[PDB]
Amino acid sequence: AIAQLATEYVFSDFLLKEPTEPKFKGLRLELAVDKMVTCIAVGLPLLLISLAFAQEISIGTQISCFSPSSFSWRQAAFVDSYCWAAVQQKNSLQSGNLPLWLHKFFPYILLLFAILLYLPPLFWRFAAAPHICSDLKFIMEELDKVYNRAIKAAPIVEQYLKTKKNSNNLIIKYISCRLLTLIIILLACIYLGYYFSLSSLSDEFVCSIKSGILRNDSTVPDQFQCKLIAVGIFQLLSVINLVVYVLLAPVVVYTLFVPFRQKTDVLKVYEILPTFDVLSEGYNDLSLYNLFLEENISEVKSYKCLKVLENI
Amino acid sequence: AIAQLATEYVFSDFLLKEPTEPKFKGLRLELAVDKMVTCIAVGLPLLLISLAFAQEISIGTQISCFSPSSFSWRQAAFVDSYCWAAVQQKNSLQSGNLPLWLHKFFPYILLLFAILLYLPPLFWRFAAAPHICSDLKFIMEELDKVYNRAIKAAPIVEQYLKTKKNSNNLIIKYISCRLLTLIIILLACIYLGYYFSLSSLSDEFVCSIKSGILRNDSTVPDQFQCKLIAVGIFQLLSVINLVVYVLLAPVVVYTLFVPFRQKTDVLKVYEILPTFDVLSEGYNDLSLYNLFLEENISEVKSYKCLKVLENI
Amino acid sequence: AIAQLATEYVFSDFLLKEPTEPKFKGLRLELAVDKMVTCIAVGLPLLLISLAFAQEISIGTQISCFSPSSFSWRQAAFVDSYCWAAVQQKNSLQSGNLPLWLHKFFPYILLLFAILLYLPPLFWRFAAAPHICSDLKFIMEELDKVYNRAIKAAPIVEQYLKTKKNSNNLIIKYISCRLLTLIIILLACIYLGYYFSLSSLSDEFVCSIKSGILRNDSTVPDQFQCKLIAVGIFQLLSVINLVVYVLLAPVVVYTLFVPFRQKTDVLKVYEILPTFDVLSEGYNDLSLYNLFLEENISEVKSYKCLKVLENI
Amino acid sequence: AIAQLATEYVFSDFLLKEPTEPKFKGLRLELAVDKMVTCIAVGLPLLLISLAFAQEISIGTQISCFSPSSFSWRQAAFVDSYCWAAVQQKNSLQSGNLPLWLHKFFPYILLLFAILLYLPPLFWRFAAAPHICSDLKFIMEELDKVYNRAIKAAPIVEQYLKTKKNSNNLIIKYISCRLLTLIIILLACIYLGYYFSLSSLSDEFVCSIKSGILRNDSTVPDQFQCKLIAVGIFQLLSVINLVVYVLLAPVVVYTLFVPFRQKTDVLKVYEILPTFDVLSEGYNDLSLYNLFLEENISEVKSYKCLKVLENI
């Protein structure tokens, strides 16, 4: 059913949840915007692939060729089956031949875009997530220790953050991950725009069965009129995916500008502590860590208590 | 089966339960009215989508065209399949063409409304829920500490609440979330009202197979009588969804008026404590926090014990 | 299968079990009679809906029209499909037209009754259950404390119960919940009685295909004899549901009389304790709390030990 | 499959296991004989219902009418579908009409017997189980305390049991539960015996399609020969259920005689303790408690250690 079809990918955490792997100690390894972009960019093509070929929008068949009435049912089944296979050939289907390729393999191409839009999230989850996750746990752990020793009166962190500032290996991976995702979406928009630009009267191709014995057989008609049934649904879903992508593309490029998103005063709330001195100019790992810090610094008890004092 | 169909979305906590994510420490991130509205607004279209295309209300096919008796079964299958695809074309189906689009894609449009009615709950669950959830835990934790230190005789909270009063970023997100949900429901009511207003004798369209080879073929009839079978069920379910929505719309707009819903004396029960002095005029975060406080202040043991003393 | 069909809703806790939500701390939020009534009133229509359209009581089709032998199979399939859709129209099916509506949508109407009989339990589970559940935990917790301090010799509760006595907001919700359930059951009995009163020779309707091109077509017969196959099963199940409901209705109205069900001496067993003085006349929350107390006071260890002493 | 069909209800604890409800603290709320009787009396009709309509004993259809060769397949499908519905009518199927009702609804009647044989177990599980379960836990808890204080030398229980002796409310519920189960089994035996007594040449009924337009139609044959296919399987399974029931009936009536089953010396093993004096004549709750005690007194460590000393 369509309702349970959407339930698997939307209305429930398909890939929008923290993974059930007890190795990252329960932390957000992706930003809220990145997780939202990944879910929409990957979960929408999957939704549209299964929506297009649901048992409540389709008759059951995806191609239908009008055979002559003299043919038996199995002979007519042969024409429908042959012409479905006779889309990737040359000495037949004389109607082009490029839109017919796309119509037959449209669910595959959407799946290919789903794969290409999931790898950069997967590349980030291994090449850069465990390194940041281990660093994130240390930073949160030492901040609590600094708070505990400062409240017990009744700059190791500064040097460590400066060390991350000079290095820029992590931020390049993040930018490359976003750039790769943006390119695929831009490539997807070009394909979907081209696919939607295809005329509706293009799935009708003049197929023919003339090979081997059938060439010297003056019994079958020379040409068969076929119709790829699940095409108007494809073009309807292609523009919907295109509309979402051209709306999702500004979000991706906004994420690409890491330094502008962040604010350097995220850790400036720690200046209230007497044992904490004062602490962005380019594409550095400091900007990337601050964005990850901002997304999960609220979970520790030391930050919320300190932030309230800053609001006094 | 229909009975197990409803079981998935109703009679069981489909999205009416606290999420099984051990990051919010088991707290209600949505109000009781909001959770009820979200469940009905999202779970009803899903119920109706699968109800309309259940295997016990439909014959199995959704379109049927009366082909001439001279046609073989596969030729008749072609007409049914072609005309099902020949709903989004122009040089055919000369019966309008707008209601035929809606009849074919009615389950998709309901699913689209289900998606558009689930995003504002999802936007609230990330853009504003963790911020409130972290604040909510701190408020409950410090209230117990205040109660413990006051009962041990045998205004940090006041300033913090006043700080939230001047800021109004959280309440705007709540109002925007409710406003966005209200607009979609109002848009849904307009569509469902228009869809139900469509005459029952509109799914009958005069389809035709005349393209390529078939144009120069004086064997098939020029016009075919088709009938979209699953249409009376759609109109029956559309008005049912419309009736619920026009009953759910007053609930949504009532939720929109945040300050009138709340009562400022929710925390006035803490005046019994000697170490607690005395503590709404507009769209401020204080109103939003009080509503969230009222929905979960009863779970802490310090509030119930104190509330009984207030009732003396 | 029918056996596994019943297994889902009966022979197993479908909605007769305590919900797996670790927020009520494992307590009965509904009375034994209310839970039994809710399970029967909701789980029976679901059972009958799926029983009627099981793959072992039906041929597979729900309508069958006797087409002339000159028609092809697909043409005959059109008549069966058209007349199934031609139940909600006027210029056709000249056989009334009210019983035909009910026969086609009988599983929907039973599902509608299942929905309307589940909302008052759901309304009670949110509008009045958490308020009572939080109160119930406090009452049980303080009773153990009173027992512990009284047994350690080797009226806060009285005033609190009196405070609940004057207020009657909770009991009105309970009465309204039962009254709403009773009305729906009474409405269901009227419908089922009317549906069962329909003559068995009413599903036979004289359908016709005369619209657009088919009107000026002297090839098809003017009138078609159709037969809604799954009708005798519906009437068999309708009376069964009617018989249960007219047996369940006295149970519901008995529950409506809250003060007569309760006994005021439920907490009189605590008079044995020296530090416990002595403690119904109308529709008050005290009656509602006593009923909930009576259903779960046996789980605490302090009550059973004290009750035995009362039996001396 | 039949093998996995039986697996659900037999070879695995379908209802023969202690319920997974952490409210009875893991105790046997039903006797071993009662649980065995309930499992067989309820799990057998469910097994036979699904066995009769398995996809490996049936052709797929349950009725088949021999239409004339001039009919099309859909017309022949109409006759099979109509006559399947034309079993509850009068001006047709002139073959009686009582066995035809039973043959069509035999799986329903077995399911009805399954329901009626499950309610008394369900009535016992709520009206009398929690009361006994709470009492059972107290009795076991105090027996350990008595053993602990008697072994520490290096009649509250007597009065409590006597108090239960005068009261007989619990035993009446047990007897009524067994009596209700016995009546249903006796009613089931009468039905199954009558159903098995039906001649094998009774499912063949002379159906007819003569109503509305078909009466004035000298094209169809006046009478149709039909055959309810799944009837010999029903009679085979009916006698099997009958044989088990007439074997299960003596077990039920043996359980009805509560005082004869029990032995009063179950707790006489506690006379070894110096601080335990000496402790059936009719239908009293003392007999019921002793039966429940005998079924679960072996789980406590104090009883086994004491019982060994009694065997010296």
PDB file of C-alpha atoms in Angstrom, chain A residues 1-7 10-13 16 18 25-28 32 35 47 50-59 61 64-73 76-77 80 200-201 203-206 223-230 232-233 236-237 298-299 301 304-305 307-309 311-312, chain B residues 8-9 14-15 19 21 23-24 42 45-47 49-50 53 55 60-63 70-75 77-82 84-86 88-91 101 104-105 107-108 111 114-115 118-119 122 125-126 130-131 134-135 137-138 141 156 159-160 163-164 209 211-214 217 219-220:
ATOM      1  CA  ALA A   1       0.000   0.000   0.000  1.00  0.00           C
ATOM      2  CA  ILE A   2       1.078   3.594  -0.629  1.00  0.00           C
ATOM      3  CA  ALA A   3       0.407   4.604   2.981  1.00  0.00           C
ATOM      4  CA  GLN A   4       2.659   1.885   4.396  1.00  0.00           C
ATOM      5  CA  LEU A   5       5.053   2.583   1.514  1.00  0.00           C
ATOM      6  CA  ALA A   6       5.648   6.138   2.729  1.00  0.00           C
ATOM      7  CA  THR A   7       5.692   4.934   6.349  1.00  0.00           C
ATOM      8  CA  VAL A  10       8.888   9.056   5.904  1.00  0.00           C
ATOM      9  CA  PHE A  11       6.867   9.595   9.117  1.00  0.00           C
ATOM     10  CA  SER A  12       9.526   7.355  10.718  1.00  0.00           C
ATOM     11  CA  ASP A  13      13.270   7.687  11.249  1.00  0.00           C
ATOM     12  CA  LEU A  16      17.192  10.627  10.242  1.00  0.00           C
ATOM     13  CA  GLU A  18      21.229   8.361  15.464  1.00  0.00           C
ATOM     14  CA  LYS A  25      28.553   6.742  22.723  1.00  0.00           C
ATOM     15  CA  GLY A  26      25.325   8.317  21.479  1.00  0.00           C
ATOM     16  CA  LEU A  27      26.339  11.552  19.757  1.00  0.00           C
ATOM     17  CA  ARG A  28      25.185  13.369  16.630  1.00  0.00           C
ATOM     18  CA  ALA A  32      20.876  18.863  11.720  1.00  0.00           C
ATOM     19  CA  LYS A  35      20.957  15.026   8.294  1.00  0.00           C
ATOM     20  CA  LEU A  47       9.747   7.189  -2.151  1.00  0.00           C
ATOM     21  CA  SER A  50       8.159   2.773  -5.137  1.00  0.00           C
ATOM     22  CA  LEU A  51       5.284   5.238  -5.619  1.00  0.00           C
ATOM     23  CA  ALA A  52       5.583   5.067  -9.409  1.00  0.00           C
ATOM     24  CA  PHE A  53       5.365   1.256  -9.428  1.00  0.00           C
ATOM     25  CA  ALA A  54       2.823   0.809  -6.645  1.00  0.00           C
ATOM     26  CA  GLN A  55       0.025  -1.704  -7.183  1.00  0.00           C
ATOM     27  CA  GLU A  56      -2.533   1.123  -6.879  1.00  0.00           C
ATOM     28  CA  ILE A  57      -1.330   3.491  -9.633  1.00  0.00           C
ATOM     29  CA  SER A  58      -0.345   0.940 -12.279  1.00  0.00           C
ATOM     30  CA  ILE A  59      -2.346  -1.670 -14.180  1.00  0.00           C
ATOM     31  CA  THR A  61       2.184  -3.965 -16.841  1.00  0.00           C
ATOM     32  CA  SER A  64       1.622  -2.648 -23.916  1.00  0.00           C
ATOM     33  CA  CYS A  65       1.795  -3.267 -27.665  1.00  0.00           C
ATOM     34  CA  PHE A  66      -1.332  -3.424 -29.820  1.00  0.00           C
ATOM     35  CA  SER A  67      -1.046  -6.795 -31.547  1.00  0.00           C
ATOM     36  CA  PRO A  68      -3.432  -7.786 -34.359  1.00  0.00           C
ATOM     37  CA  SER A  69      -6.580  -9.644 -33.378  1.00  0.00           C
ATOM     38  CA  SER A  70      -5.393 -12.751 -35.249  1.00  0.00           C
ATOM     39  CA  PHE A  71      -2.641 -13.289 -32.662  1.00  0.00           C
ATOM     40  CA  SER A  72      -3.160 -15.633 -29.742  1.00  0.00           C
ATOM     41  CA  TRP A  73      -2.678 -14.304 -26.223  1.00  0.00           C
ATOM     42  CA  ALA A  76       0.585 -10.984 -28.037  1.00  0.00           C
ATOM     43  CA  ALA A  77       2.487 -11.587 -24.801  1.00  0.00           C
ATOM     44  CA  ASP A  80       4.852  -6.988 -25.342  1.00  0.00           C
ATOM     45  CA  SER A 200       4.547  13.057 -23.527  1.00  0.00           C
ATOM     46  CA  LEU A 201       4.100  11.555 -27.015  1.00  0.00           C
ATOM     47  CA  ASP A 203       6.892   6.656 -25.114  1.00  0.00           C
ATOM     48  CA  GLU A 204       4.924   5.549 -28.190  1.00  0.00           C
ATOM     49  CA  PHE A 205       7.527   3.725 -30.279  1.00  0.00           C
ATOM     50  CA  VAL A 206       6.996   1.777 -33.498  1.00  0.00           C
ATOM     51  CA  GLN A 223       5.306  -2.721 -37.311  1.00  0.00           C
ATOM     52  CA  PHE A 224       3.717  -2.775 -33.854  1.00  0.00           C
ATOM     53  CA  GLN A 225       2.389   0.209 -31.917  1.00  0.00           C
ATOM     54  CA  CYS A 226       3.631   0.082 -28.325  1.00  0.00           C
ATOM     55  CA  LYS A 227       3.048   2.369 -25.356  1.00  0.00           C
ATOM     56  CA  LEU A 228       5.193   2.591 -22.228  1.00  0.00           C
ATOM     57  CA  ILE A 229       2.360   2.924 -19.722  1.00  0.00           C
ATOM     58  CA  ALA A 230       4.318   4.118 -16.673  1.00  0.00           C
ATOM     59  CA  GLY A 232       3.214  10.042 -17.342  1.00  0.00           C
ATOM     60  CA  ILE A 233       3.674   8.958 -13.734  1.00  0.00           C
ATOM     61  CA  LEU A 236       4.965  13.702 -12.776  1.00  0.00           C
ATOM     62  CA  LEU A 237       7.416  12.330 -10.213  1.00  0.00           C
ATOM     63  CA  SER A 298      23.524  21.656  24.969  1.00  0.00           C
ATOM     64  CA  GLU A 299      23.419  18.012  26.104  1.00  0.00           C
ATOM     65  CA  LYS A 301      24.880  19.792  32.119  1.00  0.00           C
ATOM     66  CA  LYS A 304      23.346  24.897  30.305  1.00  0.00           C
ATOM     67  CA  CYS A 305      24.148  25.957  33.872  1.00  0.00           C
ATOM     68  CA  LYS A 307      24.851  29.650  29.784  1.00  0.00           C
ATOM     69  CA  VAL A 308      22.168  30.815  32.228  1.00  0.00           C
ATOM     70  CA  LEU A 309      24.768  32.768  34.208  1.00  0.00           C
ATOM     71  CA  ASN A 311      22.261  35.501  30.465  1.00  0.00           C
ATOM     72  CA  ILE A 312      22.392  37.522  33.707  1.00  0.00           C
TER      73      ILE A 312
ATOM     74  CA  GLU B   8      -1.064  -0.084  12.074  1.00  0.00           C
ATOM     75  CA  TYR B   9      -2.155   3.571  12.139  1.00  0.00           C
ATOM     76  CA  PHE B  14       1.748   5.048  15.361  1.00  0.00           C
ATOM     77  CA  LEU B  15       3.113   8.544  16.044  1.00  0.00           C
ATOM     78  CA  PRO B  19       9.855   8.375  20.484  1.00  0.00           C
ATOM     79  CA  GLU B  21      15.202   7.732  21.363  1.00  0.00           C
ATOM     80  CA  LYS B  23      18.403  11.318  24.079  1.00  0.00           C
ATOM     81  CA  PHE B  24      15.476  13.390  25.409  1.00  0.00           C
ATOM     82  CA  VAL B  42      -1.280  12.648   9.331  1.00  0.00           C
ATOM     83  CA  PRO B  45      -4.910  10.382   5.050  1.00  0.00           C
ATOM     84  CA  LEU B  46      -2.703   7.308   5.396  1.00  0.00           C
ATOM     85  CA  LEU B  47      -5.708   5.346   6.651  1.00  0.00           C
ATOM     86  CA  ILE B  49      -5.193   5.958   1.136  1.00  0.00           C
ATOM     87  CA  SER B  50      -4.889   2.289   2.078  1.00  0.00           C
ATOM     88  CA  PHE B  53      -7.196   0.561  -2.417  1.00  0.00           C
ATOM     89  CA  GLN B  55      -8.258  -5.805  -1.600  1.00  0.00           C
ATOM     90  CA  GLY B  60      -8.368  -5.276  -8.385  1.00  0.00           C
ATOM     91  CA  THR B  61      -8.357  -2.870 -11.317  1.00  0.00           C
ATOM     92  CA  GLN B  62      -8.735   0.900 -11.097  1.00  0.00           C
ATOM     93  CA  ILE B  63      -9.682   1.592 -14.736  1.00  0.00           C
ATOM     94  CA  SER B  70     -13.732  -8.532 -31.627  1.00  0.00           C
ATOM     95  CA  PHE B  71     -10.658  -7.633 -29.553  1.00  0.00           C
ATOM     96  CA  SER B  72      -8.573 -10.326 -27.916  1.00  0.00           C
ATOM     97  CA  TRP B  73      -7.986 -10.160 -24.172  1.00  0.00           C
ATOM     98  CA  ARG B  74      -4.489  -8.711 -24.553  1.00  0.00           C
ATOM     99  CA  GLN B  75      -5.784  -6.076 -26.979  1.00  0.00           C
ATOM    100  CA  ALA B  77      -5.725  -5.136 -21.780  1.00  0.00           C
ATOM    101  CA  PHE B  78      -3.856  -2.666 -23.991  1.00  0.00           C
ATOM    102  CA  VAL B  79      -6.846  -0.304 -24.105  1.00  0.00           C
ATOM    103  CA  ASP B  80      -7.245  -0.382 -20.322  1.00  0.00           C
ATOM    104  CA  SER B  81      -3.510   0.150 -19.838  1.00  0.00           C
ATOM    105  CA  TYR B  82      -3.180   2.809 -22.553  1.00  0.00           C
ATOM    106  CA  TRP B  84      -4.866   4.693 -17.840  1.00  0.00           C
ATOM    107  CA  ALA B  85      -1.677   6.272 -19.172  1.00  0.00           C
ATOM    108  CA  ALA B  86      -3.760   8.409 -21.561  1.00  0.00           C
ATOM    109  CA  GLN B  88      -2.177  13.166 -18.842  1.00  0.00           C
ATOM    110  CA  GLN B  89      -2.299  13.691 -22.627  1.00  0.00           C
ATOM    111  CA  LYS B  90      -4.190  16.230 -24.730  1.00  0.00           C
ATOM    112  CA  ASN B  91      -4.929  14.840 -28.206  1.00  0.00           C
ATOM    113  CA  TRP B 101      -5.907  14.025 -13.282  1.00  0.00           C
ATOM    114  CA  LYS B 104      -5.852   9.020 -11.138  1.00  0.00           C
ATOM    115  CA  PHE B 105      -3.552  10.666  -8.572  1.00  0.00           C
ATOM    116  CA  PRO B 107      -3.918   8.671  -3.333  1.00  0.00           C
ATOM    117  CA  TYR B 108      -0.787  10.641  -4.236  1.00  0.00           C
ATOM    118  CA  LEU B 111      -0.026  11.346   0.600  1.00  0.00           C
ATOM    119  CA  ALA B 114       0.236  13.722   4.754  1.00  0.00           C
ATOM    120  CA  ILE B 115       3.824  14.771   4.012  1.00  0.00           C
ATOM    121  CA  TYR B 118       4.153  15.958   9.021  1.00  0.00           C
ATOM    122  CA  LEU B 119       7.010  18.362   8.236  1.00  0.00           C
ATOM    123  CA  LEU B 122       9.332  17.302  12.197  1.00  0.00           C
ATOM    124  CA  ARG B 125      11.212  18.218  16.621  1.00  0.00           C
ATOM    125  CA  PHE B 126      14.661  19.486  15.541  1.00  0.00           C
ATOM    126  CA  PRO B 130      16.088  19.843  21.713  1.00  0.00           C
ATOM    127  CA  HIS B 131      16.494  23.469  22.801  1.00  0.00           C
ATOM    128  CA  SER B 134      17.402  20.709  27.410  1.00  0.00           C
ATOM    129  CA  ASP B 135      15.833  23.766  29.057  1.00  0.00           C
ATOM    130  CA  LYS B 137      15.304  19.205  32.114  1.00  0.00           C
ATOM    131  CA  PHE B 138      17.251  22.029  33.778  1.00  0.00           C
ATOM    132  CA  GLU B 141      16.137  19.592  38.029  1.00  0.00           C
ATOM    133  CA  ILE B 156      17.940  31.968  39.968  1.00  0.00           C
ATOM    134  CA  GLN B 159      15.660  35.582  36.597  1.00  0.00           C
ATOM    135  CA  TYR B 160      15.977  32.703  34.121  1.00  0.00           C
ATOM    136  CA  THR B 163      15.254  36.098  30.533  1.00  0.00           C
ATOM    137  CA  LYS B 164      13.121  33.749  28.431  1.00  0.00           C
ATOM    138  CA  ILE B 209      -6.133   4.878 -29.348  1.00  0.00           C
ATOM    139  CA  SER B 211      -1.319   7.425 -32.696  1.00  0.00           C
ATOM    140  CA  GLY B 212       1.421   6.276 -35.035  1.00  0.00           C
ATOM    141  CA  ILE B 213       0.167   3.195 -36.857  1.00  0.00           C
ATOM    142  CA  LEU B 214      -3.266   3.155 -35.195  1.00  0.00           C
ATOM    143  CA  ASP B 217      -6.100   1.622 -39.057  1.00  0.00           C
ATOM    144  CA  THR B 219     -10.165  -1.746 -37.467  1.00  0.00           C
ATOM    145  CA  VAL B 220     -10.315  -0.399 -33.896  1.00  0.00           C
TER     146      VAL B 220
END
